[PDB]
Amino acid sequence: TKQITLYTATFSPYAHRVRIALEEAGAEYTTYDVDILRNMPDWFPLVNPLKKIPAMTFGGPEVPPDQPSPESAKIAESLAMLEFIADLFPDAKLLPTDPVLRARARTFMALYENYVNGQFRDVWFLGTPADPLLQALEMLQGALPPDGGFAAGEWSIADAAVIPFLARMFPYLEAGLGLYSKEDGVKMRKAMASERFARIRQYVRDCRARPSFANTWAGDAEQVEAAKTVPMLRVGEHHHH
């Protein structure tokens, strides 16, 4: 009964996480785009004082999203929102019930956030060498069940946390978007197509095939165009060596 509003942006893989989870929960919710990196509305700090997307309001009176209510709960940080949606919709089984399988899901989320995300950031925003990123991706791939399935076996919020980033990698590379050089762009594209990374390719296909991805994805070319609006992706710019 309590309303959910997700403040979103098409380029934001963090917001994408939460859209995927809300779809998997079968939740009723509103999305509201915010041009957070170029033209933040003056009211936005009322829903998130950190001034980041995603932001979520929960409950309170129904109001237009650009007139947030002080009575709604203000929830920040995408992974906290993922666990929140699992808590709100237990019958949707967005986590396993078995403690050890739940821990696989939490561990996978931590592996991505602690060791992989920053490597994506270094390569895409600074143009540092790709090898440490490929190494981190091989580590993450190693945590998947080798014979198939999602991070914790059945689909869980762990896969909502990770697919937005992995799914952007291939189309961004194909467009040459990011501060890495052509040489590293080619090296990454080759690596990600090689048998070294067959398992994570299967993982990306399996996550993308679910309705929760299809219904929250603009299309590869459309996502690339939204990403080009990101100031620190510096479209047209590349660092070398």
219 near Ca ion, rule: CB under 5 A: no
**Least spacing, CB of residue 28 vs ligand GTX, in Å:** 22
Q: Which does 87 bind (CB under 5 to 8 A by kind): a copy of itself, ligand GTX, Ca ion, none?
A: a copy of itself
Instruction: Please say which residue, 19 or 168, places its beta carbon nearer to ligand GTX.
Output: 168
**Least spacing, CB of residue 120 vs ligand GTX, in Å:** 4
The whole-angstrom separation of Cα 157 and Cα 146 is 19
Number of residues that bind ligand GTX (CB under 6 A): 26
Other beta carbons within 10 angstroms of residue 46's beta carbon come to 16
83 near a copy of itself, rule: CB under 8 A: yes
151 near a copy of itself, rule: CB under 8 A: no
Region 7-46 residues binding ligand GTX, contact defined as CB under 6 A: 11-14, 36
The whole-angstrom separation of Cα 79 and Cα 208 is 19
Among 186, 187, 184, 180, smallest CA distance to 234 is for 180
Q: Which does 151 bind (CB under 5 to 8 A by kind): ligand GTX, Ca ion, a copy of itself, none?
A: none
Instruction: Please say which residue, 80 or 214, places its beta carbon nearer to a copy of itself.
Output: 80
Annotate each residue in 24-63 with x if it binds a copy of itself (CB under 8 A) or - if it does not, as one string: -------------------------xx-------xx----
230 near ligand GTX, rule: CB under 6 A: yes
Q: Which two tokens stand for residue 14?
A: 């963090």
- Among residues 19, 104, 106, 168, which is the contact residue for ligand GTX, using CB under 6 A? 168
Question: Rg of the chain's alpha carbons, rounded to an integer?
Answer: 18
Binding site for Ca ion (CB under 5 A): 142
Binding site for ligand GTX (CB under 6 A): 11-14, 36, 51-54, 77-79, 114, 117-118, 120-121, 124-125, 165, 168-169, 172, 227, 230, 232
